[PDB]
Amino acid sequence: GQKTNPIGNRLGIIRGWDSNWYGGNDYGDKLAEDHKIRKYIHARLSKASVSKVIIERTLKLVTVTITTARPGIIIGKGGQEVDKLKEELKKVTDKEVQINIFEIKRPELDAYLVATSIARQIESRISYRRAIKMAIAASMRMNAEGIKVLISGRLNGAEMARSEGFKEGRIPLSTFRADIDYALAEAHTTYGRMGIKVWIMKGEVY
Amino acid sequence: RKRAAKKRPLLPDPRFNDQLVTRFVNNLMWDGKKSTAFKVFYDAIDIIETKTSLEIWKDALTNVMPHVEVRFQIPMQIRPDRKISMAMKWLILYARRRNEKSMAQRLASECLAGAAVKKRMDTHKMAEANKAF
Amino acid sequence: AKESMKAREVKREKTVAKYAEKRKAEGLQRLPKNASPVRLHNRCKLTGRPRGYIRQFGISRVTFREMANNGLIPGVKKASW
RNA sequence: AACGCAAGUUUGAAACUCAAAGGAAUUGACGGGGGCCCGCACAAGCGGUGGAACAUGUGGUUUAAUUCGAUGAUACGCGAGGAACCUUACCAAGGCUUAAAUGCAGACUGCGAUUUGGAAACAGAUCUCAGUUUACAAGGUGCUGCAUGGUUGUCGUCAGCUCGUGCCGUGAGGUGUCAGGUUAAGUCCUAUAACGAGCGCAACCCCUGUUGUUAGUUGCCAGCGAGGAACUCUAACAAGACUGCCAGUGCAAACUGUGAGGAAGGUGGGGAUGUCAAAUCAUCACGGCCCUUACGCCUUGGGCUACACACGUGCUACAAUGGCCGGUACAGAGAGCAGCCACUGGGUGACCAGGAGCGAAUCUAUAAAGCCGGUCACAGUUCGGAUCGGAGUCUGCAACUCGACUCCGUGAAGCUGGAAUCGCUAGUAAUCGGAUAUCAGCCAUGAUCCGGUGAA
Numbered sequence A: 001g002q003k004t005n006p007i008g009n010r011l012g013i014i015r016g017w018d019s020n021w022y023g024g025n026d027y028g029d030k031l032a033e034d035h036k037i038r039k040y041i042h043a044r045l046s047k048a049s050v051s052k053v054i055i056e057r058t059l060k061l062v063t064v065t066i067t068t069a070r071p072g073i074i075i076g077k078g079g080q081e082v083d084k085l086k087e088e089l090k091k092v093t094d095k096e097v098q099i100n101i102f103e104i105k106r107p108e109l110d111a112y113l114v115a116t117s118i119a120r121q122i123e124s125r126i127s128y129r130r131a132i133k134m135a136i137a138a139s140m141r142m143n144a145e146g147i148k149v150l151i152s153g154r155l156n157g158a159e160m161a162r163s164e165g166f167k168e169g170r171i172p173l174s175t176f177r178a179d180i181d182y183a184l185a186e187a188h189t190t191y192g193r194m195g196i197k198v199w200i201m202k203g204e205v206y
Numbered sequence B: 001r002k003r004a005a006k007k008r009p010l011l012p013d014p015r016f017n018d019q020l021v022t023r024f025v026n027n028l029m030w031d032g033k034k035s036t037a038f039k040v041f042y043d044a045i046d047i048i049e050t051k052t053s054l055e056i057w058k059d060a061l062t063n064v065m066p067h068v069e070v071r072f073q074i075p076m077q078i079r080p081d082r083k084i085s086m087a088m089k090w091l092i093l094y095a096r097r098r099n100e101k102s103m104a105q106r107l108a109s110e111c112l113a114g115a116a117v118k119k120r121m122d123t124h125k126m127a128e129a130n131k132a133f
Numbered sequence C: 001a002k003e004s005m006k007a008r009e010v011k012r013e014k015t016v017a018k019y020a021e022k023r024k025a026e027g028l029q030r031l032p033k034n035a036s037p038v039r040l041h042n043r044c045k046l047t048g049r050p051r052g053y054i055r056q057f058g059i060s061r062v063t064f065r066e067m068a069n070n071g072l073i074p075g076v077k078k079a080s081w
Numbered sequence D: 001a002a003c004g005c006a007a008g009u010u011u012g013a014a015a016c017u018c019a020a021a022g023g024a025a026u027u028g029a030c031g032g033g034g035g036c037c038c039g040c041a042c043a044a045g046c047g048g049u050g051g052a053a054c055a056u057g058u059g060g061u062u063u064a065a066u067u068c069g070a071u072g073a074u075a076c077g078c079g080a081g082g083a084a085c086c087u088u089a090c091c092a093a094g095g096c097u098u099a100a101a102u103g104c105a106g107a108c109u110g111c112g113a114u115u116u117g118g119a120a121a122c123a124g125a126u127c128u129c130a131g132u133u134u135a136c137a138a139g140g141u142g143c144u145g146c147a148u149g150g151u152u153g154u155c156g157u158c159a160g161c162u163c164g165u166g167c168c169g170u171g172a173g174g175u176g177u178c179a180g181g182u183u184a185a186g187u188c189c190u191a192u193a194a195c196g197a198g199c200g201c202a203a204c205c206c207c208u209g210u211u212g213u214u215a216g217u218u219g220c221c222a223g224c225g226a227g228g229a230a231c232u233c234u235a236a237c238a239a240g241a242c243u244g245c246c247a248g249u250g251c252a253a254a255c256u257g258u259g260a261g262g263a264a265g266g267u268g269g270g271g272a273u274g275u276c277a278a279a280u281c282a283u284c285a286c287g288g289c290c291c292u293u294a295c296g297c298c299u300u301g302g303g304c305u306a307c308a309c310a311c312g313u314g315c316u317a318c319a320a321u322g323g324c325c326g327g328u329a330c331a332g333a334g335a336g337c338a339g340c341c342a343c344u345g346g347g348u349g350a351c352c353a354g355g356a357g358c359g360a361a362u363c364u365a366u367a368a369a370g371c372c373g374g375u376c377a378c379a380g381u382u383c384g385g386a387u388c389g390g391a392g393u394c395u396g397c398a399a400c401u402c403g404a405c406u407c408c409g410u411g412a413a414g415c416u417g418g419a420a421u422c423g424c425u426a427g428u429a430a431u432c433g434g435a436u437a438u439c440a441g442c443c444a445u446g447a448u449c450c451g452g453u454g455a456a
Helices: A026-044 A080-092 A113-124 A130-138 B019-028 B035-047 B054-059 B083-094 B118-128 C003-015 C061-071
Strands: A052-056 A062-067 A146-151 A180-184 A194-202
Touching: A026 A052, A026 A062, A026 A080, A052 A130, A113 A130, A113 A146, A113 A194, A130 A146, B019 B035, B083 B118
Parallel strands: none
Antiparallel strands: A052 A062, A146 A194, A180 A194
């Protein structure tokens, strides 16, 4: 670990923030609730492969805008499929709560859906060798010239740890104007825990 | 491989409007205090008014200017300018051994032209010995 | 950071909820010795970790760093001057 | 056995033991081999450490316990950026077993004040989201970072590390990446079985260094007058530095000087960082093993401060370019209802009572060094600050183990420190002061910053 987070040193630059709420010195419980809501959503609906939870905590309101990989099963028929989820998370955080479900544009380019799909294939234990190239090809079909998938130790049920590069294209991490999104999702297998890191380089922003 | 030097340009003083007095008080400074160093130098040069002006001080500063230094212990000329920094350093270093009362009092070594010429004499005696190099 | 030790803090916080008018009214104090504001040590409130705490965000340095890196606190950036 | 005076020459086995010895060449590593370069690396200069007293850290020795980890560079004022209880994970003793918290499973309904046993935890009574059985989990700062994920230090802000195609070599491999110039650089030109590409460098980012526009609230006070839109200022957008201008060298990059300019030749400083089975199973998660009348859990008291010795990191003093009583100025940033305090009264003092303003360019929080004047006129001193006795203030249930401050006593070691070693090239070192973080108080001399004076 000698590399800074690619989206870490980009906040005052092209990369923005996930949450959106300004509270003077009052982070506290407003941060604890934001930490519990994301994990509750990700545990309640994981088969939809959620991408992000834009949490807008304005006055007397909390918007929970969800970006998924499959909004069909989330909206459901008539809205009662959202009714139970909403009453659940609202009685968890008993305040005025609104939800907005967003549709996806090429779900193979999210830097987190790729990671969770590779992790699910790993924990399903098919080959460990087809998933990385599957993701690479399904991502390089379209644009986003750069994709880099790095995997951690405890591979193939071995004894010692080892890491694999498995990258191709161009990913200029040393350039702040590069639009590199990344998210670390790891698979909990029986031989331990295997870590996955996905970098996606779409293009320079202005 | 230092590749450069800048010599750190200076600025003269109000009294005596001389550029050597500034270097002297700069070598006299301690803990970054120039006003008290100027005060001590002025008291010293006014105490020296017993016997002329700072002319006698600047001529006594000449008797402490070596012409060759040893540095197989080979002798060599120092520089046309480092002479008046070795002279000032030697004067200020050996004026702090005088067991007088104040600094302006023990700085009365410009009239000793007295632990200042001894250094130049020893340097010359040690350089004339290793003359075969 | 054990469950019992972090629940002890919640128990002490719930204990210092009453007696707010009793401790406000050097003697005449027969208390359970837990109803005092000198025993409320601040945890990280997610993991419950002492030895490092920020009153603003209410979390430890490691969680603060990880969230500020992976974009979970609005406003934080990379300081440079 | 033959030859020779001898030293010795010629011929010449076996028992036993190993799965290897050996030649050529390749990549790396190394050399007290060579060549070309870089870095406060050395040479020069300044300030230190090692000498003295104090504060924390660690080793070592005792203790019922002195909680755990790192113990070269990359540990030792570190995790820990607040040990009286709490933190606390350790020790001694009182109280618990499906649990001191959390989900569940099947019943029985609509928090407070009083009283006893107590060191508390907990038991026994009045009274008016809570209380009680059964089988379930649960839990561990328990053991291995040599099973791990993640997250770091180091080489190292050094310039290196590879790939695609094509050619050479039987092959490992070689070329591109070599040779000559260029500088911070694998940053670029010249030719060359090489042609291109990726990571890295640079650029893209933050602050500071000038000017212009946009706007004057709670910046600010120049012209009239008794209220102003010019400046400082704040924060948005722009210009400005491109060796671009002028001189010489060169096919070329590119250096050596001058002129203009606020600036120079990456203006300066930061975020960026392409093997050591290295640190953490004590931020967190986790594969395997172990305990569950428990190595699990609630309490009181104690320990983490123990002390014959050592090494590391710091502060202060060893003095009169100094101390003291006095007058007189000049800031910045940051903080403030988990509070900052104007003003008045009591007290030498810490502080106490009354009481405005302020949730913040509005209100509060009073700098030192420096300047002027008098003293001391050289030594254990009018330097020094450890140690000890008595009397008070603040926090907190609690100040003995173990808080801070004030106050009246007192003046111990220390008069420039041994080989050996450390940091620094410009607003730098050195020195002085202020603020923030953990916050009931505090060990704060630690850590992170800012401002003043300012070198060789």
